[model samples]
Target: MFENITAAPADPILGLADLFRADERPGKINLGIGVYKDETGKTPVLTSVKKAEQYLLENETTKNYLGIDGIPEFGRCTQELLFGKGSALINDKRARTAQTPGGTGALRVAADFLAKNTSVKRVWVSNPSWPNHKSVFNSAGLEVREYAYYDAENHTLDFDALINSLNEAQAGDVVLFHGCCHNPTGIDPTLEQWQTLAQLSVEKGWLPLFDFAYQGFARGLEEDAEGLRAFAAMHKELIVASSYSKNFGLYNERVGACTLVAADSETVDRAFSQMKAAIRANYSNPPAHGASVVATILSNDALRAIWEQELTDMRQRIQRMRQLFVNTLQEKGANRDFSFIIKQNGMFSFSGLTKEQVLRLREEFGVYAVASGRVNVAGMTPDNMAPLCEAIVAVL
Candidate 1:
């Protein structure tokens, strides 16, 4: 059996990271993964998380596993973070949540739950979504489809095409939307466009599923969640996967939640039980430390304030990186307007470098990006931007 087995293809994102690590170049930079890095090129632990961990260490009780639905306070705080505190949906009991290993786990659970229970079997992911979206959904026996989203040539959202494709979705079809800081492309719709999409979902009877992996990493918690709130307000049912990976700097912790917004409390209770079944069959329960860390910070006023400020600092740093990259590229006489980099939100940039160009950048300049021309903006620093742009200019 071992001899007959074939090797799997290297993951597009992780493969680049591996290659970058192996490269011995003194100036090598990895812009492949979505992990956030500071000016010193380190993914630092958030101070709030450090404090929370200390608190847990001093006051901990036992290592008993959390419930299948995870810690109740974790779910409650996660819900409030995604939707606002004291949200109408929460007060009305229209939304329910289940903590998972991570955002990916949350996605997998949602996919399995939908495939097994709901009539919906087809999921419409963005044309260039986080690559794993298709794989995870497919693994759960749901047909994965793509909808036109980003316009590479012009570097903007292809809203018209996106609207056209979504218009054709059948009733009960699951349509996934990036809540904010869209992965890979980093281009999200305006509030007006979000309103339009929400209206379309209402008319078309499509179930909106939001992959909210980077809330508070985009503009802010409130602005990033507008699309989610818009859909939940309009449609009777909603789905969201919220992650603490980026904002909390808890990538290794694998903390996230899968949430469902139903028509009423009865529907919410029923939907939640079925989702809990999905949880029980898989990992059984979420790990304790990360959720407790999050809950402690969320519940304490001082720790919560520190987390918010630190998150805001990280967001501002990404923005600065974006501005520095374009400014350097243009100043170095690259002969192209990369001004759109400043406009794109989040950690990734949909750099329009072709596959050949990308490979050349990797081979020649030791700067790595995805084959699809995406770069992680968080990887850029004053030390890296000059060489990164130099490589980009040479490749272009």
Candidate 2:
């Protein structure tokens, strides 16, 4: 059995990290993963999180088992924070929540629950999404279909084509949406557009499976969450999976949740029971630390306010870097306009470089980017910005 096994190729993003660490070049830059690195080139822990950790250290009563649904307050807190504290959906008993390892874990858990319980043939993800989306559904034995997304030729969303394809999707089909800051592309649906999609979901009877992996890191938590709230309010049932990894800088801590907004209290309760069973069956129970920190942060007014600012700072910095990066490219006398970079939101950007160009940049300039041309715009620093822009110019 062991002899029959073959070595597997490394993950594109993770493999880039490995190679980047091994590089000896002084000016080497890595733009593979959508991790936010600050001006100091570090993904620093938020000050609020540090304060929460200190409070937890002094006041933690016990490391008791969080119930299968996790910190009971989490359902209240996360829902309130994500959908707003005054959300009528919450008041109606129309939603539910459970903890998982991370956003991926939450998605996998939802897939597992669906696999065990539903006869749905497949799930729908956008074209050119995070690579892991395919494998996540496949691991749950769900087939995948894709809708039109980024149009490389036009450098914009194929919105009309996407809506057409979505209409073709059958009733009860799962449509996985990025609530904000679409990974790899950094594109998102407008509020009016999301409202249209919500109406479509209702008319077609499609189930929303939202992967909101970025909350505060996008346009800020409240702004990033409008889609989910709008959809949940319009639709009777929906699925939401979110992570604290990006917002809280707790990537290694792996805190995430899968939420179900059922039609009524009975259905909502049933979903939670089934979801907890799924959690128990799969990973037993979710982890403790990340959720603890997130809950602690959200519950405190002062800490929460401070965390919001930290998030805004990250968002604005990424926006500024996008402008600067594209401006640098234009100043270097590249013919094609790269003003599209400024148009993208969040930590990542689709650099529009072909695979060959990307590889050439790596080989010649030690400026690493994903083969698919997706680069973490958030990873660029003040110092590397000039070199990274120059490398992009040179590669062309």
Candidate 3:
């Protein structure tokens, strides 16, 4: 009966990881998966999370299923974390939040919500968006298209092309944007640029969808949220899908939420209920432990402070790694200018390494990077920094 079934393609990131692990090469580096590692080459759980877990362990409750939307405080706290407490949208009671499995799950829920409720079925993603962005919406039976985002030749954002593409989009169509820390390319727009896009979104009457997976990775929590805040302040109705996997170091926990900013309280009520219904149909309900941990941290002032500090350290380390990689390349007399690495924020840097070059780096030097040349900055330590640069230089 299953003889006709065809094998599926391996996931690019996970497949690369598996190949890297099988090599058995000493001093090999794996930069495929987008996880945050430290100087010790370990993904450390945050102190805030440890504290939260300890607290939960002491003052625990039943493992009964959470509501269709998961923990209430998880949604509320994540909402305020994304849109600051003074947000007029929240003040006016137009924004609604519901927890999900993770950012991917949140996007899946949001995509299904749009496909089911709105007349529009098309969503525009950036040219070099996360691989899952297109797949998630497509799997939900929605049409997906791409707008110009990264300019490979110039190594920068193609702002004009992006603006033109959006201008050409029809009214009520959804445009997906990386809230900050753009994946794959690592190029994000300036505050003014985001403001301009917000104006254009308003003029074009397009619905904005912000996927905020790496909120505190690019900059500080408040600073990294500038783009989302700018878009929200335009008084435009939009959607925000957030993730705690990166910032909270809850990769296995899969904590996240989908927040919608509607025109009124009534719309929010209806929209939120529909999203909950989507959750009900998909997984029945989200898991509880992750959301509870996030809620505990955000609810306590002390835990939240610790989390901010830990997040700052992680972001700062990534920035330093960016500089080290570029500086080492220059020191090795690489003919090309690599200063773009420092300019690009967040964990990954689109290092402009060709797919062939990346393969060579893996085979020749046991240095593994994504085929697109995206390197996980957190994977570099002071020891591996020089070797990684040497591998790139060798391939060049």
Q: For model 1, what is the C-alpha lDDT against the true structure?
A: 0.88
Q: Rate the local accuracy (lDDT) of all candidates.
A: 0.88, 0.86, 0.87
**C-alpha TM-scores of all predictions:** 0.97, 0.97, 0.97
Q: Residue by residue across 261-341, what tens digits does model 2's lDDT show?
A: 888989889877887898888878878888989898888889989988888888888888888888888888777788887
Ranking by lDDT: 1, 3, 2
RMSD of every prediction: 1.2, 1.3, 1.3
Worst 10 residues of 1 by lDDT: 13-22
Winner by lDDT between candidate 3 and candidate 2: 3
lDDT of 2 at 301: 89
> Compared with the true structure, what per-residue lDDT tens digits does model 3 show for residues 1-396?
999999988777878877987998888998888898899999988889998999999998688877887887887788778889877887888888888889999999999999888888789998887887888999889999879888888888989988887776898899998988899888899999999999888988889999999988876788889998998988558998999999889998888999988889998898889988888999999888888999998888999899899999999998888888888999977889998888788889888888999989998899888888889998888888888888888888
Give the 10-residue window scoring lowest on summed lDDT in candidate 2.
214-223
Q: Give the TM-score of candidate 2.
A: 0.97
